[PDB]
């Protein structure tokens, strides 16, 4: 097999990591296990520490707020790798044992057990003017040589890898999403009925999404247009409970329905990133470096879990909107509209490999 390795610029400290995508099962997260090779002749008395930080840069990196830091560190774990097993004995995964066999006796393990409820690696699209660190939560494993934990770590003898925390589509699809509404205007005492439903609940990136629209217009009003929009909600919890809807795919069909009539149809639309390039703030799936990645996958957060800690929670909704006429015997050019929303999941299937930005 292959193990990734990074080296400190000074070259006296190297970090070996088994993989850079750590799948997040809802109950528990895969441990971040790895090895660090040090130079005892160089670290005569200083210790070698390792940390796993979960940075979050919702604030504009290119800008700054006076007297305040828009950044945040949801999770920060520490471990005293060198000297070895200072606190207590810990089991070594087979990968760690293999690395220790391959590397000399100067290689020492490190392992992190991430708490279950934490954000997934997501980044927001920066647009054609911004630069620097990409906005959005992301994880990092940083190993350094310090005499004390709080002492400043010289950047010339510390090495940082960027890891990813990803979730894969649930194995058992849930109930098919469906929705229905019945509006009643002030013109006729009859209900305009709308009913929409998707083919399935879990969709894989690039797979087309099918909406089975069914309208019954018993009222004396005519519907002009029908708009189907797959839109993305990004619940951010940096300072507030914000919401950022952003239509990632749209289709506007001029299929009218006469009064006291019916209309059943199937609209197929596929959300992809080719035409969503300019939409700043769109949440992408997360990248190790500057590269290309699909639209951010949904988040399978546990039901009833506190939302305070969560950094970014992504979800998707297909919105069906009927642009019903508002014309009458005497009035303006108004045209009301009824709407319905269908939640679905947009994730990857559980793979045997997932190269981030090959």
């Amino acid at each position: 097999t292959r193990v990734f390795k990074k080296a400190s610029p000074n070259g006296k400290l190297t970090v070996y990591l088994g993989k850079r995508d750590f799948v997040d099962h809802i109950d528990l997260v895969e441990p971040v296990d790895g090895v660090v090779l040090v130079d005892p002749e160089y670290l005569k008395e200083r210790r070698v520490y390792v940390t796993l930080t979960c940075a979050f840069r919702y604030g504009r990196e290119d800008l700054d707020v006076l007297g305040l830091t828009f950044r945040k560190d949801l999770f920060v774990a520490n471990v005293q790798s060198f000297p070895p097993a200072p606190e207590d004995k810990k089991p070594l995964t087979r990968l760690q044992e293999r690395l220790i066999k391959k590397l000399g006796e100067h290689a020492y393990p490190f392992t992190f057990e991430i708490p279950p409820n934490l954000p997934c690696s997501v980044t927001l699209q920066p647009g054609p003017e911004d630069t620097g660190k990409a906005c959005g939560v992301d994880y990092e494993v940083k190993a350094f040589c310090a005499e004390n934990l709080e002492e400043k770590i010289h950047k010339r003898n510390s090495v940082r890898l960027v890891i990813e925390k990803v979730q894969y589509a649930p194995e058992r699809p849930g109930p098919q999403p469906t929705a229905e509404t019945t509006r009643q205007f002030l013109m006729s005492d009859k209900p305009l009925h709308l009913e929409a439903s998707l083919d399935k609940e879990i969709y894989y990136h690039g797979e087309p999404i099918s909406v089975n629209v069914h309208v019954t217009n018993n009222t004396n009003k005519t519907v002009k247009k029908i708009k189907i929009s797959v839109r993305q909600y990004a619940d951010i919890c940096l300072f507030n409970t914000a919401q950022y809807k952003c239509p990632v795919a749209m289709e506007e069909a001029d299929d009218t329905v006469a009064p006291s009539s019916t209309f059943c149809k199937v609209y197929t639309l596929t959300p992809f990133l080719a035409n969503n390039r300019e939409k700043r703030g769109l949440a992408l799936d997360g990248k190790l470096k500057h590269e290309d990645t699909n639209l951010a996958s949904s988040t399978l957060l546990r039901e009833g879990a506190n939302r305070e800690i969560l950094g970014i929670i992504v979800s998707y909704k297909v919105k069906v909107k009927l642009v019903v006429s508002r014309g009458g015997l005497l009035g303006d050019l108004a045209s009301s509209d009824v709407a319905v929303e269908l939640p679905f999941t947009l994730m990857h299937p559980k793979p045997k490999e997932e190269p981030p930005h090959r």
Epitope: H205, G206, T270, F272, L273, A274, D292, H348, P351, P355
Partner: antibody
């Protein structure tokens, strides 16, 4: 799951031609479409590629400008528009598909259409 | 970058049941992103192994792929009379994708 290529035939040198690869069971957004040409008695050579999910389009350095690759997602079809054909473009052109997300080799191939550019 | 892959040998004579090995050397380093195709005369290629170690779903277990440094090897442990074709080698890490010269497996007589 059957990509089928068509539109290949004899063309005078410097002429035009259009190869159409119709994919059945593939979503042009979850798959990337490549055109690979094999000369008579020679190894395979990659000639073009299109990935619609990102809109990316790549060509081999030997067919820059002359060849244009497009995709009609409505018909789930890919087109190679070959203009100004030199005598070195005679070959069997096969259309292949690859998993769009995390490319894992050219899964499925077309049956290949001959293209004979001779005066 | 334009990476040139050299597949050797360019010919082979082997009898049924023998072990056949074909090697592929890449100019630069390709991180396990190599695939092995198999084109019989007339027909179109067919993926056999991807990532230099995996087997495509539907391939006989005799075919095996291995990597060492920048040298990849495809091994048919027990050659069968249906395994005598031309086997190629692709390196799909850097655009443009490059194929090997093609190794042709004959039948010993």
């Amino acid at each position: 799951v059957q990509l089928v290529e068509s539109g290949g035939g004899l063309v005078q040198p410097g002429g035009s031609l259009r190869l159409s690869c119709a994919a059945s069971g593939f979503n042009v957004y979850s798959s990337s479409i490549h055109w690979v040409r094999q000369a008579p008695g020679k190894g395979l050579e990659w000639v073009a590629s299109i990935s619609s999910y990102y809109g990316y389009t790549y060509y081999a350095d030997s067919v820059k400008g002359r060849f244009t690759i497009s995709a009609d997602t409505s018909k789930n079809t890919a087109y190679l528009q070959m203009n100004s054909l030199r005598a070195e473009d005679t070959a069997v052109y096969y259309c292949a598909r690859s998993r769009q997300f995390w490319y894992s080799g050219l899964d499925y191939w077309g049956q290949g259409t001959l293209v004979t550019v001779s005066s | 970058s334009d990476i040139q892959m050299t597949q050797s040998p360019s010919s082979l004579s082997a009898s049924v049941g023998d072990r056949v090995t074909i090697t592929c050397r890449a100019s630069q380093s390709v991180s396990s992103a190599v695939a092995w195709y198999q084109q019989k005369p007339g027909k179109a290629p067919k993926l056999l192994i991807y990532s230099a170690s995996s087997l495509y779903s539907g391939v006989p277990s005799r075919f095996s792929g291995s990597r060492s440094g920048t040298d990849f090897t495809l091994t048919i442990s027990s050659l069968q009379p249906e395994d005598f074709a031309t086997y190629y080698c692709q390196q799909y890490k850097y655009v443009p994708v490059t194929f090997g010269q093609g190794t042709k497996v004959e039948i010993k007589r």
